Enzyme design. Structure first.
Site, PDB file in Angstrom:
ATOM      1  N   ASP A 186      -6.565   6.216  -4.795  1.00 53.56           N
ATOM      2  CA  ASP A 186      -6.025   4.882  -4.890  1.00 53.56           C
ATOM      3  C   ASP A 186      -6.085   4.345  -6.323  1.00 53.56           C
ATOM      4  OD1 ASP A 186      -8.695   2.838  -3.367  1.00 53.56           O
ATOM      5  OD2 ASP A 186      -8.548   3.989  -5.241  1.00 53.56           O
ATOM      6  N   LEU A 245      -8.511   3.898   3.077  1.00 52.80           N
ATOM      7  CA  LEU A 245      -9.560   4.395   2.196  1.00 52.80           C
ATOM      8  C   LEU A 245     -10.378   5.439   2.888  1.00 52.80           C
ATOM      9  CD1 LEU A 245     -11.153   4.543  -0.433  1.00 52.80           C
ATOM     10  CD2 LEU A 245     -12.724   2.812   0.508  1.00 52.80           C
ATOM     11  N   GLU A 280       0.783  -1.235   0.000  1.00 52.63           N
ATOM     12  CA  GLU A 280       0.000   0.000   0.000  1.00 52.63           C
ATOM     13  C   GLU A 280       0.811   1.281   0.000  1.00 52.63           C
ATOM     14  OE1 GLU A 280      -3.898  -2.021   0.103  1.00 52.63           O
ATOM     15  OE2 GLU A 280      -3.273   0.052  -0.412  1.00 52.63           O
ATOM     16  N   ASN A 311      -7.102 -20.341  -9.695  1.00 48.98           N
ATOM     17  CA  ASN A 311      -8.455 -19.824  -9.589  1.00 48.98           C
ATOM     18  C   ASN A 311      -8.466 -18.377  -9.112  1.00 48.98           C
ATOM     19  OD1 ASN A 311     -11.278 -19.544  -7.736  1.00 48.98           O
ATOM     20  ND2 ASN A 311     -11.493 -20.811  -9.587  1.00 48.98           N
ATOM     21  N   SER A 351     -12.226 -20.218  -4.767  1.00 45.75           N
ATOM     22  CA  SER A 351     -10.847 -20.180  -4.292  1.00 45.75           C
ATOM     23  C   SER A 351     -10.832 -20.586  -2.804  1.00 45.75           C
ATOM     24  CB  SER A 351     -10.245 -18.795  -4.506  1.00 45.75           C
ATOM     25  OG  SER A 351     -10.133 -18.469  -5.901  1.00 45.75           O
ATOM     26  N   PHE A 384      -8.115  -6.433   3.334  1.00 45.77           N
ATOM     27  CA  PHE A 384      -7.797  -5.037   3.557  1.00 45.77           C
ATOM     28  C   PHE A 384      -8.002  -4.288   2.237  1.00 45.77           C
ATOM     29  CE2 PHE A 384      -5.118  -2.146   6.060  1.00 45.77           C
ATOM     30  CZ  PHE A 384      -4.764  -1.175   5.118  1.00 45.77           C
TER      31      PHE A 384
HETATM   32  K   LIG Z   1      -2.217   2.644  -1.891  1.00 42.55           K
END
Ligand SMILES: [K+]
Ligand SMILES: [Cl-]
Ligand SMILES: [Cl-]
Length: 164
Positions: free
Chosen positions: A20, A32, A11, A132, A117, A104
């Site tokens: 983002d 966020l 991130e 997958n 999955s 996240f």
């Molecule tokens: K970021």
């Protein structure tokens, strides 16, 4: 390597409000702020989040604080989600981390829809799961990060984050 360092790599760290990969207002270590196209809105979410009138800029300390909260909340959601708790519990530490990473990034809900999955993971069919996992918007929109996470699940090692 651990979930925090892992996410820190995926991130980045930015002290000013930015957009983002999806075009959404965010700050810090992938915190966020809102899906709102309104910067003022984002700014409002930021002040509320931090507890002060920031004017869209925060300190490293502050970023880390939301980061810790975010990680914790991700984990906490996993445990509270019926579609995720079992796979999570069935996994070793490293892999658990890859799951936290995903949540996240895309929220609990998004992750829970990875039904197939999830099932493969639970069966411990690493290779299969990995193939997958790649058949997703997630992988297509953020392939490098996705490849890292996928690798993590396939191998149960931190190799993909080894030199980042
Ligand atoms: K970021
Ligand atoms: Cl918050
Ligand atoms: Cl990427």
């Amino acid at each position: 390597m651990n979930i925090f360092e892992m996410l820190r790599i995926d991130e980045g760290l930015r002290l000013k409000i930015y957009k983002d990969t999806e075009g959404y207002y965010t700050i810090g270590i992938g915190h966020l702020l809102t899906k709102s196209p309104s910067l003022n809105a984002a700014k409002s979410e930021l002040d509320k989040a931090i507890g002060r009138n920031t004017n869209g800029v925060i300190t490293k300390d502050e970023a880390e604080k939301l980061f810790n909260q975010d990680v914790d909340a991700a984990v906490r959601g996993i445990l509270r989600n019926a579609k995720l708790k079992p796979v999570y519990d069935s996994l070793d530490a490293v892999r658990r981390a890859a799951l936290i990473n995903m949540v996240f990034q895309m929220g609990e809900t998004g992750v829970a829809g990875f039904t197939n999955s999830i099932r493969m993971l639970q069966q411990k069919r690493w290779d299969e799961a990995a193939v997958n996992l790649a058949k997703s918007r997630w992988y297509n929109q953020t392939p490098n990060r996705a490849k890292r996470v996928i690798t993590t699940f396939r191998t149960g090692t931190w190799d993909a984050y080894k030199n980042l």
